């Protein structure tokens, strides 16, 4: 009845064209075989076609195809001309398409600069809704607004450097060389719990629902209840430091400087599998419930089956340390000290792209994110680069530190659909430590 209202009321009578004259179901059926680019061009043909092409369900389907889940409702109205009844799904498509475009080629707006952690390293970074959490070897964490750039809180408590953190809207958890974890209220900044049990640095952690698992230089892992503050379980069997950990609520997976990856059932504190094969330290890890993926100093990345413990793929071709990997639906993106990023299909072992070329990173890759369109990579060269995940081609430098080749580095990044946040600094004073936040939203 959107279309009924608009036809009966704009009154576009006497057109001499094919689709104007069809029943409207059939005109819409025809229009359904078109891609959005075409629908937008059809819409500029005449009033009648415009009204048809603005059909709400036609665009709901187009949105589900790009995985756009909510419609978008605007307001500034106007009543500009005789009345138009916009489709929320259509403006949601268009929103997303302009956002994408803005990341690829939109003028780089000057980013907000959040100065903090003076003269120290930002060792972990978290970004959740409109909150950013930076953690540091100054012993603190700071909570910031991604919207205004203000520092909202400063989480003081640790007597030791912060090196790991997790966040889920308003719960933050930190891990330190002071051998503890801490649980914090982001809004108020109070430390609600302090978790004792480890005796050496809390190097990594992973949070799932109401439990975090921590891994430590002590060679153990502990599983902790976040509400109660109690340590539920203790996972013993590693022989050297645990550098990386994943937890899905059902199995813990840990990777350690003993070259080993272990899979555990936490409830019974038992190691179900020791995954052996890496010929050097394991540094990075991903896990999706079915596959474990482990990055080594071996320069290898191994893919394994949690259920059996069997190596499925040994993915090769990086030349140095794989420092971080992201895994999503059987696509894996790996960042390496060799300055290169690769994209892999972990079902087949295929290396789909290697990100390099004339605008390659000049030094180690420190961090990365990706979605179905882009990879974003950061580096000690002081840039953050945007690449096309489908073609593997460089698109552009999102950030280029002037001090990049004199000490400035990008330690890590987080991105939302709309925003990019970068932790930046230097070991020699050439770049003051800070976060950079860039906005790619569009007006809408």
């Amino acid at each position: 009845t959107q279309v009924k209202h608009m036809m009966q009321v704009i009154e576009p009578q006497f057109q001499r064209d094919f689709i104007s004259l069809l029943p409207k179901e059939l005109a819409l059926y025809v229009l359904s075989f078109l891609e959005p680019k075409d629908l937008l061009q059809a819409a500029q043909t005449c009033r009648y076609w415009r009204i048809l092409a603005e059909d709400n369900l036609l665009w709901r389907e187009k949105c589900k195809e790009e995985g756009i889940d909510e419609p978008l409702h605007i307001k500034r109205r106007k009543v500009i001309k005789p009345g138009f009844i916009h489709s929320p799904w259509k403006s949601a498509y268009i929103r997303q398409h302009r956002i994408d475009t803005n990341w690829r080629r939109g003028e780089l707006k000057s980013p907000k600069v959040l100065k903090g952690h003076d003269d120290h390293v930002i060792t972990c970074l978290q970004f959740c809704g409109n909150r950013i959490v930076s953690g540091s070897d100054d012993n603190t964490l700071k909570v910031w607004s991604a919207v205004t750039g203000k520092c909202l809180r400063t989480l003081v408590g640790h007597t030791g450097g912060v090196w790991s953190s997790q966040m889920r809207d308003n719960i933050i958890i930190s891990g330190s060389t002071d051998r503890t974890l801490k649980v914090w209220n982001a809004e108020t900044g109070e430390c609600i719990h302090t978790l004792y049990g480890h005796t050496s640095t809390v190097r990594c952690m992973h949070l799932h629902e109401k439990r975090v698992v921590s891994g430590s230089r002590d060679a153990t892992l502990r599983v902790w209840d976040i509400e109660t503050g109690q340590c539920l379980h203790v996972l013993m069997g590693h022989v050297a430091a645990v550098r990386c950990v994943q937890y899905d609520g059902r199995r813990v997976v840990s990777g350690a400087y003993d070259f080993m990856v272990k899979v555990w059932d936490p409830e019974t504190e038992t190691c179900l599998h020791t995954l052996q094969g890496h010929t050097n330290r394991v540094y990075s890890l991903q896990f999706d419930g079915i596959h474990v993926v482990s990055g080594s100093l071996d320069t290898s990345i191994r893919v394994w089956d949690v259920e059996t413990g069997n190596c499925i793929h040994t993915l090769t071709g990086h030349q140095s340390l794989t420092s971080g990997m992201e895994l999503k639906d059987n696509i894996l993106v790996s960042g390496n000290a060799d300055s290169t990023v690769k994209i892999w299909d972990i079902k087949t072992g295929q290396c789909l792209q290697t990100l390099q070329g004339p605008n390659k990173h000049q030094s180690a890759v420190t961090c990365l994110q990706f979605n179905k369109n882009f990879v974003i990579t950061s580096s000690d060269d002081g840039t953050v680069k945007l690449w096309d995940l489908k073609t593997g081609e460089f698109i552009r430098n999102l950030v280029t530190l002037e001090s990049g080749g004199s000490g400035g580095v990008v330690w890590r990044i987080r991105a939302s659909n709309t925003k990019l946040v970068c932790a930046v600094g230097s070991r020699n004073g050439t770049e003051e430590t800070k976060l950079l936040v860039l906005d790619f939203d569009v007006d809408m």
Binding site: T123, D137, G161, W163, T177, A364
Partner: peptide, 10 residues
Amino acid sequence: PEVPPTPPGS
């Protein structure tokens, strides 16, 4: 060649 920051040893 270069590895990321890591906590100091004991």
